[PDB]
């Protein structure tokens, strides 16, 4: 019973449904990831090597579209936002290796390496991002080799009674990070050593993103 | 007892496979808020919910003359259309789930090249197809399902083949490839290749996470194809077996009438595959519940 | 001198807000009761219209 | 109770040869 | 800005065949609908086809259908009217029409200049012809209808039309009482279900001209005689 | 010892804001409404769904002619609906996707949306080219934007996560009134009736009353023990409501400067996302994580309905200028009509 107008107005309404799932297709094809960590920790280095408030990075590889998102200027309160990134893709956290005696600087007594500790057990054992994967990188491995020659881990590690060299230390802080995930079970971490002039971030990223959406379409299917 | 086991059977699976199988429909309807589903392995698993719900509705209809007197009592023009749409109904089940099979394949070893065509509407359009197919498939099976003359005053539903000297071979083995034979070796293939393929090569296989994975998708993958197997081979076996037979005894009757509920038994099992061996599907169902 | 220069500012503030005038509570309740017996009957939430003036049948 | 040694083809009995 | 410019009109042979273009400019053309309404010489105006936007939906006028086809090139923002077996009927001047259809809005907002072509149902009524007018005094023009323009919606499907000497038609009023965008609040429509009123306050010499009543409460959309202004 | 002399003087201030709030207390919401016969069961049906957005809906805002709304979602689309046919008017493709509020104009020419971009952006509905395209960009704040509320076609009141509120002109782009006082982020505004006065709702559990002409904080309003996440003024413009995390919604009185009344269950332990009133301000609504919305009787604080509609958190909801329905938007991406029957 519509009227020729009422007629045309539906029609209208219809192709608006029509971009609206194109729309949606398109965006489900799409790699989101939220990218954290903390100050100098080579997070944006990150950036540099993918080329207001959220800073979004769009990149191609391999047949593939990421949409990296960085909320590092974000200075509110991050429990008011962060549940607006449940559903991303994965999440890429950032940290330094080198910054394990280092102290903040607004502190003055808290030790670098575990205010990134601190931040990346918050953020994995969030409520929003229960089975989401982390992407966990781990910078300046070339500043941290030569710095374990005089600075010791046991500043950092009382407890760490290894070899003072990088290929025990860095593990060390690995498994460290790794030990802090709460749910061994709905998610994984995966861990990449980079550095200032490495060239396989990138493809790091594609390789874990890849595993990502093979477990979802496990769980789609019903396999998992 | 005789008398009494067998329909036992055959109660106890259609009921338990209905049962089974509106559950799978109901929740996936839900999942979808009483709209066009938007998720292509949703579209396949509620497809072959329906087909196996008409498999087994329409067991009844069909073991009436192997169970009472051994007489049909709906006639020749039932006797057709019955005959057919039993067929139609194992064949489409076993088609959408060997496209099922194919389609976590392609979700799995081309993760990335598989989302420009793995669409609700070309999974539809693909499903509409696969009843295409089933009713070629099961056209010797109505040109020819005639009543059939027993000695006595009881006729039965039947296939009464033209030369069934000769035509008796190629009736069996086109039905065994297409049914049995060609969907089980594509079925097989798919998971095969997706346990080889499950995992990324970067994975932290050490973690628990990857072990857990690996260990509940070895086992779903390993429960569809046994289930398929075990409920399809024996039919298929004595559908080979009696070609030889010519006069079958008793003990060969009692078991290809078991042959025949295995059959159904799997369009009862298929959904409680998905409801068991799914932990993201049982949870939401038990929330409900 | 941050501290020092905020905390004059705090002080500025709440003078003004300790001087504002305050009415009793069973006035200010009364107020709220009333407006709504004056606009109860036309209130389609609280006292549902017939389904021909519904614009949501 | 019946004479149960008829031939079959499929779900359906097929006529003894 | 918005632009509508036609072309493809020229003198052709009776029983022939020919192609009028439709160039828009300055506006989302894929968003609108498109209309071709002629104009015979002497004559009013004449609705000939419609093409929604997304070239879903297809009307026609009787006199045309089956030899007129109307079609659209969204990517070049171009409409089409391939007109065959042309008659001395089809003499006329076809203007581009864009309406775009939703909640509010008002169609037939644009019309274009114009291309002339020459050849070698509710019924809108406008008993009065001609009317004349001083300036600064009030006009009413008044336009029937065979059926009731109202709705079970509650709109009232009548536009209102003003076409200068030598301009193209001007929406005024749209669904009966909405004065279009741009047009002087003097003019008011007012009606109600079969007969209606547009209302011209303080006349000015721009004013002057034809003004038609068109329904759009169903295809085909037919317009008023027309009742001609003149000082 | 002059900053210790100065924070002792605050304290003193506090005690006689305190005490003076005390000595207007005479009586309770509760004991003069506790005459009144109770609204009964509140009973409403989902006469619409809206249907075509594709992730979590954050903002929801009704037009004045009481049939248009826009809607905010997380999928980069801004939606105007014809709530009486479902149609879909018109779609709004965002820059940012991570909108958190939407606006409609009173004269309906315009709608706002704004997230953590920090970005206030105007939309024009009404353009000649038959498009929505972004008119202004209003940028200034440096935290995500939590609400936005014209007051004209040219002002518009914005809240944000930088723990301040701005009123800007259009026209020029320039915030021209910062309400700054706030010692959190701030996550809701509401305008009042005659728009000379809005209140805000902020992190610090802290409500407070601002003159937009003026430009200074009138009243604050403090009780809740968690982030204040809605806040709507009631019809007569003379008290308001807020919804925090501590699963109460609070109803304050602006004359009486105090809290007038407590709208809490024992069963309710989620966080409360939205609320507003009925056009009599009997009723009041109230969106929570629960996946419900609850109806209250703002006069004598009982839970009169639930509309149990939504799949997911319901985080957004509006009533009608006329009173006439209630939308309600969720993360379950879908928006629903609602109200009673004879």
């Given at each position: 019973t519509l009227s020729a107008e009422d007629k045309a107005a539906v029609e209208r309404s219809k192709m608006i449904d029509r971009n609206l799932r194109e729309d949606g297709e398109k965006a489900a094809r799409e790699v989101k990831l939220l990218l954290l960590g903390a100050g100098e920790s080579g997070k944006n280095t990150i950036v540099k090597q993918m080329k207001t408030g959220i800073v979004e990075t769009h990149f191609t590889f391999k047949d593939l579209h990421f949409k990296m998102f960085d909320?590092?200027?974000?200075?509110?309160?991050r429990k008011k936002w962060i549940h607006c990134f449940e559903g991303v893709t994965a999440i890429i956290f950032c940290v330094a290796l080198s910054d394990y005696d280092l102290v903040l600087a607004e502190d003055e007594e808290m030790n670098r390496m575990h205010a990134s500790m601190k931040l990346f057990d918050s953020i994995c054992n969030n409520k929003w991002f229960t089975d989401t994967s982390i992407i966990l990188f781990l910078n300046k491995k070339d500043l941290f080799e030569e710095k374990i020659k005089k600075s010791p881990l046991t500043i950092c590690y009382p407890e760490y009674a290894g070899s003072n060299t990088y290929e025990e230390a860095a593990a060390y802080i690995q498994c460290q990070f790794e030990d802090l995930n709460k749910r061994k079970d709905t998610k994984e971490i995966y861990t990449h050593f980079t550095c200032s002039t490495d060239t396989k971030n990138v493809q790091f990223v594609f390789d874990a993103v890849t595993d990502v959406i093979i477990k979802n379409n496990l769980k789609d299917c019903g396999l998992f | 007892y005789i008398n009494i086991i067998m329909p036992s059977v055959f109660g106890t699976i259609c009921l338990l496979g209905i049962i089974g199988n509106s559950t799978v429909i109901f929740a996936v309807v839900k999942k979808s808020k009483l709209h066009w589903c938007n998720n292509v392995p949703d579209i396949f698993i509620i497809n072959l919910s329906v087909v196996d719900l008409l498999f087994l509705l329409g067991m009844p209809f069909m073991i009436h003359q192997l169970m009472?007197?051994?007489?049909?009592?709906?006639?020749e023009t039932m006797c057709t259309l019955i005959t057919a749409m039993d067929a139609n109904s194992q064949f489409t089940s076993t088609y959408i789930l060997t496209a099922m099979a194919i389609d976590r394949y392609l979700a799995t070893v081309h993760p990335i090249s598989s989302t420009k065509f793995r669409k609700p509407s070309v999974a539809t359009l693909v499903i509409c197809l696969l009843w295409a197919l089933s009713f070629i498939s099961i056209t010797p099976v109505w040109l020819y399902a005639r009543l059939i003359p027993f000695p006595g005053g009881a006729v039965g539903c039947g296939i009464r083949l033209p030369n069934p000297d000769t035509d008796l071979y190629w009736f069996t083995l086109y039905q065994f490839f297409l049914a049995f034979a060609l969907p089980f070796v594509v079925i097989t293939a798919a998971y095969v290749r997706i346990l080889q393929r499950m995992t990324s090569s970067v994975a932290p296989a050490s973690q628990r996470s990857i072990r857990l994975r690996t260990k509940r998708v070895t086992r779903t993958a390993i429960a569809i194809c046994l289930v398929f197997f075990v409920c399809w081979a024996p039919y298929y076996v004595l559908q080979l077996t009696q070609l030889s037979i010519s006069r079958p005894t008793l003990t060969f009757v009692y078991l290809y009438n078991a042959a025949i509920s295995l059959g159904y038994a799997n369009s009862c099992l298929n959904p409680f595959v998905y409801i068991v061996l799914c932990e993201t599907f049982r949870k939401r169902l038990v929330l409900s519940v | 001198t941050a501290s020092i220069a905020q905390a004059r500012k705090l002080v500025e503030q709440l003078k003004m807000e300790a001087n504002i005038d305050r009415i009793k509570v069973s006035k200010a309740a009364a107020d709220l009761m009333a407006y709504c017996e004056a606009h109860a009957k036309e209130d389609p939430l609280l006292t549902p219209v017939p389904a021909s003036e519904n614009p949501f049948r | 109770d019946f004479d149960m040694l008829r031939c079959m083809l499929g779900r359906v009995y097929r006529p003894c040869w | 800005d918005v632009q509508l410019v036609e072309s493809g009109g020229g003198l052709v042979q009776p029983g022939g065949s020919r192609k009028l273009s439709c160039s828009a400019s300055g506006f989302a053309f894929s968003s609108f609908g498109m209309h071709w309404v002629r104009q015979a010489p002497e004559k009013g105006l004449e609705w000939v086809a419609y093409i929604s936007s997304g070239s879903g939906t297809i009307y026609y006028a009787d006199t045309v259908k089956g030899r007129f086809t109307i079609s659209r090139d969204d990517p070049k923002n171009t409409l089409f009217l391939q007109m065959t077996s042309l008659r001395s009927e089809d003499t006329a001047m076809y203007y581009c029409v864009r309406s775009i259809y939703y909640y509010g809005s008002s169609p037939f907002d644009f019309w274009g200049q114009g291309t002339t072509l020459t050849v070698s149902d509710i019924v809108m009524t406008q008993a009065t012809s001609s009317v004349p007018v001083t300036p600064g005094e009030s006009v009413s023009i008044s336009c029937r209808s065979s059926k009731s323009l109202l709705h079970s919606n509650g709109n009232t499907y009548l536009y209102w039309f003003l076409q200068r000497p030598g301009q193209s038609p001007q929406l005024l009023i749209?669904?009966?009482?909405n004065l279009a965008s741009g047009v002087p609040d003097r003019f008011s429509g007012s009606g109600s279900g079969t007969a209606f009123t547009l209302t011209i306050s303080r006349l000015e010499a721009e004013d002057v001209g034809v003004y038609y009543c068109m329904q759009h409460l169903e295809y085909p959309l037919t317009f008023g005689a027309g009742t001609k202004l003149e000082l | 010892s002059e900053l210790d002399q100065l924070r002792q003087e605050a304290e003193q201030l506090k005690n006689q804001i305190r005490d003076a709030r005390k000595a207007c207390a005479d009586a309770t919401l509760s004991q003069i409404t506790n005459n009144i016969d109770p609204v009964g069961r509140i009973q409403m049906r989902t006469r619409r769904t809206l249907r075509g957005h594709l992730a979590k809906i954050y903002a929801m805002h009704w037009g004045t002619d009481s049939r248009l709304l826009v809607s905010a979602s997380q999928d980069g689309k801004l939606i105007i609906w014809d709530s009486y046919t479902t149609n879909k008017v018109h779609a709004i493709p965002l820059r940012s996707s991570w909108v958190m509020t939407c606006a409609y104009a009173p004269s309906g020419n315009y709608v706002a949306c704004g997230g953590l971009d920090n970005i206030c952006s105007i939309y024009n509905l009404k353009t000649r080219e038959g498009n929505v395209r972004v008119s202004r960009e209003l940028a200034g704040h440096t935290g995500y934007l939590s609400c936005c509320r014209f007051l004209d076609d040219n002002q518009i009141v914005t809240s944000s996560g930088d723990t301040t509120c701005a009123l800007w002109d259009i026209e020029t782009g320039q915030q021209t009134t910062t309400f700054t006082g706030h010692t959190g982020d701030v996550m809701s505004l509401s305008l009042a009736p005659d728009t000379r006065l809005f209140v805000s709702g902020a992190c610090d559990a802290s409500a407070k009353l601002w003159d937009?002409?003026?430009?200074?904080?009138?009243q604050t309003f403090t009780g809740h023990e968690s982030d204040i996440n809605a806040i709507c003024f009631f019809p007569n413009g003379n008290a308001f409501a807020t919804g925090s995390d501590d699963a109460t919604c609070r109803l304050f009185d602006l004359r009486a400067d105090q809290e007038l009344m407590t709208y809490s269950h024992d069963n309710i332990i989620c966080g409360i996302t939205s609320v507003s009133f009925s056009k009599s301000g009997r009723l009041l609504l109230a969106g929570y994580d629960d996946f419900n919305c609850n109806v209250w009787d703002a006069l004598k604080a009982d839970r009169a309905g639930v509309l149990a509609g939504?799949?997911?958190?319901?985080?957004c909801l509006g009533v009608t200028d006329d009173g006439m329905a209630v939308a309600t938007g969720s993360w379950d991406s879908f928006l629903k009509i609602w109200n009673g029957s004879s």
């Open positions: 909320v590092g200027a974000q200075r509110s309160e | 009472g007197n051994g007489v049909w009592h709906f006639g | - | - | 749209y669904r009966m009482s | 937009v002409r003026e430009g200074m904080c009138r939504h799949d997911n958190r319901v985080s």
